[PDB]
Each structure stands twice: as C-alpha cells, then as structure tokens.
Design a binder for this molecule. Structure first.
Ligand code: F2A
Ligand code: MN
Ligand code: MN
Ligand code: MN
Ligand code: MN
Ligand code: NA
Ligand code: NA
Ligand code: NA
Ligand code: NA
Ligand code: NA
Length: 316
DNA sequence: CCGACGTCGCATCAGC
DNA sequence: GCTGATGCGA
DNA sequence: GTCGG
C-alpha cells in the first residue's frame, strides 16, 4: 500500500507490454522495477529517488514523476481507451488465451466474454474451460480453503500409496493468507534421476474419482494442470480453483521445493547471487559441474553464502 | 552505442 | 494421417 | 526498459 500507486502503474505497463506489444523483455523490466520499489522502505517522493534503485532507469523515473504530480499516466490512459489494446488485454485474462490468440480473436471482431460464448466453436478445450470458470479463476483462495484442499490432496495421495510424498508449495507455502491457485509437488521413492508410467496418472485418477479434480487442461507423465473444487456442505458451491501438480525425482526434492515455493522474482534473484558466487541453480539441481549434494533448502542457501530465508520472507 | 534478459512439458493444427 | 512449428501457462 | 559491456 506504501508505493502502491506506482507499483500498480508499473504492473499495468508490464501487462500491456506482454499482452499487446508482445515485448517480454519490457514486461520483465517493468516487473523487476515494480518489485524493487515494492521492497523499498520509504515513500518515494520523486523519479530521481526511485532512479537510485536497480531496475529503475530513465523512462520509469520519468513516468514516476508524471504519476506523482498528476495521479495518472497519459500513456496508460491512451492505452485503456484504445479499442484493440484494451480488448487484447482483456481477452488474455481467459486461461488458454495468450497474446497471440487474443490478437487473432480481436482481429476477427471477437473482443468480449459474450463474443467468446457466441463463438465457442473457435475455442479449444483449454480455452472453453478458461471461459467457463472465468470469474472463479480470478477469485483468490482463502488460506482456510487451502488447508481444506491440502488435507484432501495429501489424504487421497496416501490412499494410492503410502510412500508418495505430496507437498503444497507456491504462495501457500510462503504462508500467504490467500493464494491464486494450489501447486502440488509430488515424489515417490520409485522415481529418481536414474530409474514412471502411471505414477502421476494414479494420483490424478484418484483425485478425479473422489470428484476433487473436475477438469483437465493438460496432463503428461510429470505435469498436471487442471481444475478442482472443494466439496459443498445445501450450503453454497465453492468456486472452482486452478491446481498444478508436478512429479519430481525424489533426489531433487529440495531444489524443487525451493523453486516451486518461489516467488518467481525471488527465484530470479537467488539465481543471481548464485551466479555471482560461483554456482548455477535451476528447478532441479545446484551445480558448481555435477549436481552438489543437497539435504535441505538451507543447504542451497549455505552453498551460495546467503543467510537462510524462511518461506515467508521470499514473496518478492 | 548495443546485446542480454528463462527454459519447458504439453496441446493443437497448417501444411504437407 | 502425420509432424514440425507455434502457442499456452509457467 | 535497464544495465553492464
Ligand atoms: N517466472 C518464474 N521463475 C521462477 N520460478 C517461477 C516462475 N513462475 C513460477 N515459478 C515458480 C515459483 C512459484 O512460487 C511457483 C508457483 O507458480 P504460480 O504460477 O502458481 C504463482 P504463486 O507464487 O504460487 O502465487 P499465487 O498467485 O499462485 O498465489 O512456481
Ligand atoms: Mn459483441
Ligand atoms: Mn500458485
Ligand atoms: Mn500454479
Ligand atoms: Mn512433434
Ligand atoms: Na533509507
Ligand atoms: Na537504477
Ligand atoms: Na490467458
Ligand atoms: Na495465477
Ligand atoms: Na550503463
């Protein structure tokens, strides 16, 4: 809420560059600046103040000035009035419509949720589902419901095989009070770097059978993306939620939990002060080189001579 | 001045 | 019918 | 768009 006006402005610019301009490096530039400003412990009084911060340069400092003086950005006003820009931006809010599909839809006069309904025939399976749950997928998930969902996931996974280990990561694991979705990391001792054909399928199938998973967006041997829903009390239906399950080699569990706990910006940063310290971290391993042994998230921190950050202190 | 700035599993579908 | 090219969410 | 070459 502190430099919230500015970070909102920047995120909106980011989204425009990604969805309309298809300029992914400006999108990332804008998010990097929003992130460095969100972490700043002072109320920014000028663009020059922001300019001191890494990731904030000449053009963003100048936009910060306009915003502080005026309480708006003209270019964002100009964007939001443009019919093509605003329509493409809107449509990308549907899961399964990205910058390319949105643009093609808008080009052929399909620019609203009603137009999408009227044109279901031109939608693929993922986009029809994105449209069906358009509102639901934009609602956040209260931590209380994340706990209910957690217990159901871990429980049903155990019912398939007691040796599976399921871990809810993402914002949930960072201790957020609401989450955009549920991300589940799965492991099983039968699956490691060296050694599975139905390991994930068995878990998805069980979750469908107890009617927790309601839809499938994509599913392979290591990655499920779908829809789920907590069961209802006469009382009101819960909204449908996005759920991601990843099946990961047991011996890369800690690098995976680290990565899939995030945040995305944090992961970018840690990777930075690992490269600076003689290391390469990816979702699977830390290497100097062959993969160094790891027995905790802490270890990866130690390696790169960072003090351990709790999941909570990672939402950056 | 200017090149770097994430890579990937999974789904669809022109163009043969 | 097939698959290399492309798009999606991440 | 930004920053280090
Ligand atoms: N661009 C990126 N770079 C590095 N890591 C990335 C990443 N995008 C996602 N991740 C990783 C970390 C997320 O916490 C984790 C989940 O990705 P997610 O897309 O479900 C976003 P999350 O952090 O869970 O918050 P929320 O909005 O869902 O409540 O996957
Ligand atoms: Mn219409
Ligand atoms: Mn998430
Ligand atoms: Mn997710
Ligand atoms: Mn292929
Ligand atoms: Na200070
Ligand atoms: Na700067
Ligand atoms: Na989308
Ligand atoms: Na999301
Ligand atoms: Na420079």
């Amino acid at each position: 809420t502190l430099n919230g006006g500015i970070t909102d402005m920047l995120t909106e610019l980011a989204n425009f560059e990604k969805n309309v301009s298809q300029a992914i490096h400006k999108y990332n530039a804008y998010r990097k600046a929003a992130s460095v400003i969100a972490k700043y412990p002072h109320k920014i009084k000028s663009g020059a103040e922001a300019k001191k911060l890494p990731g904030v340069g000449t053009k963003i400092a100048e936009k910060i000035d306009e915003f502080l003086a005026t309480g708006k950005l003209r270019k964002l006003e100009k964007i939001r009035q443009d019919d093509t820009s605003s329509s493409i931006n809107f449509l990308t809010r549907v899961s399964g419509i990205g910058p390319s599909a949105a643009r093609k839809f808008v080009d052929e006069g399909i620019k609203t949720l009603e137009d999408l309904r009227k044109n279901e025939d031109k939608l693929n399976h993922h986009q029809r589902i994105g449209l069906k749950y358009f509102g639901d997928f934009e609602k956040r998930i209260p931590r209380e419901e994340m706990l209910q969902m957690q217990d159901i996931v871990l429980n049903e996974v155990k019912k398939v095989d007691s040796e599976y280990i399921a871990t809810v990561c993402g914002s949930f694991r960072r201790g957020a009070e609401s989450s955009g979705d549920m991300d589940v990391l799965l492991t099983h001792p039968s699956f490691t770097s060296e050694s599975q054909p139905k390991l994930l399928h068995q878990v998805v199938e069980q979750l469908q059978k107890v009617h927790f998973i309601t839809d499938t967006l994509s599913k392979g041997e290591t990655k499920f993306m779908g829809v789920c829903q907590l069961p209802s009390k006469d009382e009101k239906e819960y909204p449908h939620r996005r759920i991601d399950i990843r099946l990961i080699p047991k011996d890369q569990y800690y690098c995976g939990v680290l990565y899939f706990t995030g945040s995305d910006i944090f992961n970018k940063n840690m990777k930075a002060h690992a490269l600076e310290k003689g290391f390469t971290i990816n979702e699977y391993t830390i290497r100097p080189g062959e993969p160094l042994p790891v027995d905790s998230e802490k270890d990866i921190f130690d390696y790169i001579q960072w003090k351990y950050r709790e999941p909570k202190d990672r939402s950056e």
